[PDB]
Symmetry: D2
Amino acid sequence: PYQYPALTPEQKKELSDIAHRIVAPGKGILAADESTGSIANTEENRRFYRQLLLTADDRVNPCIGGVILFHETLYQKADDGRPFPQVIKSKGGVVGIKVDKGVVPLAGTNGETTTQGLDGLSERCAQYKKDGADFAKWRCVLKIGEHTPSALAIMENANVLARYASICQQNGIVPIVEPEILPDGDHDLKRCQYVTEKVLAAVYKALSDHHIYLEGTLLKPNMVTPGHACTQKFSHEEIAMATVTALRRTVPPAVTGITFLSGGQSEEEASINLNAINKCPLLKPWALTFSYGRALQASANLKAAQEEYVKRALANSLACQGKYTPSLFVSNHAY
Amino acid sequence: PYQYPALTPEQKKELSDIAHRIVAPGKGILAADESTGSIANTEENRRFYRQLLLTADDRVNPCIGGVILFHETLYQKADDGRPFPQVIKSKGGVVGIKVDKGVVPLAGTNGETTTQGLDGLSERCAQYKKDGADFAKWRCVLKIGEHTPSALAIMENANVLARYASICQQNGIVPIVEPEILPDGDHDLKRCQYVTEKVLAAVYKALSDHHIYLEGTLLKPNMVTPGHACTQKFSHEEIAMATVTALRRTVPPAVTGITFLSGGQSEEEASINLNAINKCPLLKPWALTFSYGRALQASANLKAAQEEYVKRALANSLACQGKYTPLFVSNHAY
Amino acid sequence: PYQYPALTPEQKKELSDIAHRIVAPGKGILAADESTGSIANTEENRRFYRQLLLTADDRVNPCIGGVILFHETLYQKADDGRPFPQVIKSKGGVVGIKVDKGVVPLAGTNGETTTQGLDGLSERCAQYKKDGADFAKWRCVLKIGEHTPSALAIMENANVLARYASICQQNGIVPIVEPEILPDGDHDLKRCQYVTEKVLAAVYKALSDHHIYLEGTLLKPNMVTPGHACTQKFSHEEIAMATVTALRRTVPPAVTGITFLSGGQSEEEASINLNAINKCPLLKPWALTFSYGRALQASALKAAQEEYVKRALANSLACQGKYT
Amino acid sequence: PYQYPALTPEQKKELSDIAHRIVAPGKGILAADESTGSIANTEENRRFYRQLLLTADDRVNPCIGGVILFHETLYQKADDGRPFPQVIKSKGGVVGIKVDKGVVPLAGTNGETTTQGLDGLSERCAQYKKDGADFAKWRCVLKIGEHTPSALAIMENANVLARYASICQQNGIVPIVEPEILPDGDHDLKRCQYVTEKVLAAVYKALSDHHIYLEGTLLKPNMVTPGHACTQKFSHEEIAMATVTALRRTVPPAVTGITFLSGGQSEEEASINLNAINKCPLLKPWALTFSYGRALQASANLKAAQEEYVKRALANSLACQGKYT
């Protein structure tokens, strides 16, 4: 192996600085990047809704290190003329942009997918950087079943994530690597922990093969939870131990932060589990915070709605510090 | 591993049939798929030049089993109004379409590239199959150097080729897999053979990992030649033995045909080397024919130009049959 | 990738020549390398039974290109005073030696195994060569199940096979690569074909990765067949087509020959399937012959020898497509 | 991926506990596992040399968390008749055993090696455990050159280390994973950093593929240094930072400890660099201590030589806490 350095020290410093800004203590990410099809529905109601979240009062400023936007929102303005990226920065936030182009089927699999979006991505990134964005989001989707995720699905999704990260970093953009393992199915907590550990190991091997600068990245994994259709109830402390155990086994300390997606978890469930993860009594050498979409937005008449959002922002700000409130076989040796 | 079949029996039969039609004995491929930048320049002149090649007299019919078109040409028409895809089929040819969107650089490498174009590919393939295409081409480019091609370069290009092939086959399109090792640099014959063998082994492992149906594919490799800056001359017999040896070591017999690219070779070297390849006294369980662009078009006033092309197409139809003519030397030395 | 050549032209020619001798037209392999635990049981009875096969009448000579021996047998003598490797060679055979040291469990799997035996293997291979052997055999074992063979089991067995092949070829020994997929289970023909295809692709990627010279190797795979408890009926034609299709999709033409293991098949079944494989109307750019143990030995002094000669003769015809 | 668990909670507990004992605060490893060929020379002199080290003053007990032995020494006895493993345990140490059988050439490479010793290793581990050993060592060797370490050499050494690790853990033995990158050559600090990073990423991917329990393992890597013939000068602070950065990019936090090999460094250089490593300001979620042979033994008349070893033990005990002038 012979190095042709991907990044200069200045580019590295820029990327590490951004990543640390996003996940600073008490800060997490508003995921407002739903597509037109997802948000469903007119361009003005979309703009007004974004404006509602993005202009909530200043209690949110210390809670929100970053906001992920959809391409359209990135180019809209608030009522006062200010471009939404300027609104976010003026409140202490970093602007992010979703850059993938959705999932597509893998032939020869049981409905597994990879994600597309690499074509002309460098030129898109360079333009987004100019237009005020400093980090990006790309979502791969995996499913636990009898024979999934398959080796093909794991390899290909990890490979496309590494390509995406590489292109972003060449453009001054911090990549959020999102390998979402879906909660569908009847598998228990142990099986989710196992699959998560295998998927993340493949992701970090791929990132290394593609020469990624881990200090200028973030990870957006699922928490480790039973399948939606498992009927065994698991405690918040078990969810936290399994999640932190899987992360400790796979995620190098150099990764700057881990911004959990919420999945199907209610607003309060998502805050409680994030808090439990931060109280877990194992060494956790990275920020453990939130990148929540619906679990920050569901309770969010203009001013009432904003209060609902601020309340959840404040709650998760506390949870990502362990400060939130709403025998061998129980020890960490059982994970 | 647990199989979720990618293709039905009927889909497979369609792909294998198309693949065999393209490389039927005596037949090869005209690669007319140069982009606008490459072909350099008006659309009229581009259209006229392609009509010139596609409407040559009926003697090319038995020589050309397929033609690769650039996107714009798939939708153009000759002077009589016939769409170029109907002109090609009426002369016995299969219509192909280049689908990649060019190379891009890999960060952290010595200027190595991968190739883009997967986004929306499936929709484009279904459209092209509708407008008369039955196969496709996708080009990856590797370069030999002190530290290249790197493991990353080999892995990534083999992977994207496999993705492209999978998508095509879902849409009834035979993919031509083209992992081109450039002839640039000062490396000798043996070094080209070594790198070709390592690359193709990675290509076919990727095709297996992605569940590709090899009988419904073609391979478009470089011949094994010295680098352009190597001053040791190598004989036609040596180029043939190294090429066939590297292929025998990596390419499953299930593959229906191998359609060489010509690289920097002259029109005549390309025919001579193709012929020597077909005369090589080792077992070759696949068609060994041509997918030539410049090596069919350089020499090609309408009628004289059309005559230079016909001549080359005839020379290469003979060459892909071995019928052409204008210890250390043994196969254990390879 | 940068080459530091593993073999000289002289070394390649020696390996290619050995490999072509073993699988020359009409010839196959007698697999007589049953371990002492397997053959069960004294040393004299073992020597005598091995002598029974190796000294069979010279009508067997055009049928037998190679004989695979267990370590003990390589160092024994026939009644007439001659070392068994001398007996084999005088009948036109190449002498082969089993060099693996059995399977071991892979932790974290459902009863899956890899194979051990690499320690000291180069020194052993140099001695076996000196003592008359020109090819070797190493057996890996995979099992089709709900979650097997797993990625680990395929990768690890492909890697150990390639290590063994590398070491053999450094000592002038042709390696027979044996990735056996067991017939155990009720899976159908097509599942076996799919797994075989996936395993063989991994095998040949690994051989490439370890710089193996394929022209100086042989492959010993399972035929592609339904699982032992499968409830569906399948013709020889179908078994032949599935098998030849899997191989055409995975085995480079440079491989000199494919010497099938008989598995659980009867003497006559293995011959009929081998004949049908050779009649399959598809391009097959390698020798397709037999490396049979029980399928040559079961029905097998002069009367027993004759039954082995008859199966030798039958399989000699089958590996040419000429067996009624 | 479908799990067939390799270890029970009880097995995991035992392995984690052993691992944490070896690398507890202020503790490291005496690597006394030289083969008869390396330690070259009578059986009796070998026994006396190792006796000298193993029975040094109780002042070393807080410094030494484990001792790696060669097979021969595991079955020798001190002058008072005590098995050496009992001498080590009574001084508060964990007993280790070298179980590899040396390197072998990889054909088709530029003199690169892999390591052998897997045959019958499970049976060897179960017996060593019975005879008092609780951890093991296996050494792979890689070389930095114009075209090395090659992909084959990295993939193959990572795979054999994982096989080794799997077998040990099945037998209650904590595996020390030693992928040594040699300092030979004139490459710079960053080249060593880059290759170390690529190698460790392959090592941990392999351990994952083989279902290794990382909390029940230790890593024994080279520090990241310039090549022995490099013409550029580097400070201890730079060596520490390059080393810590390499490890942070590759080693999961679940790994219990990293016990450095001294690889050609002098007694004092190895202490200073270990101290600098422990003072590096970045987050370091594993123990960073020593697994030293010559760096603990070179200066080590019985009582005078024993004192030279005790002093190095004390120096490195401080250094693995960042507390050594």
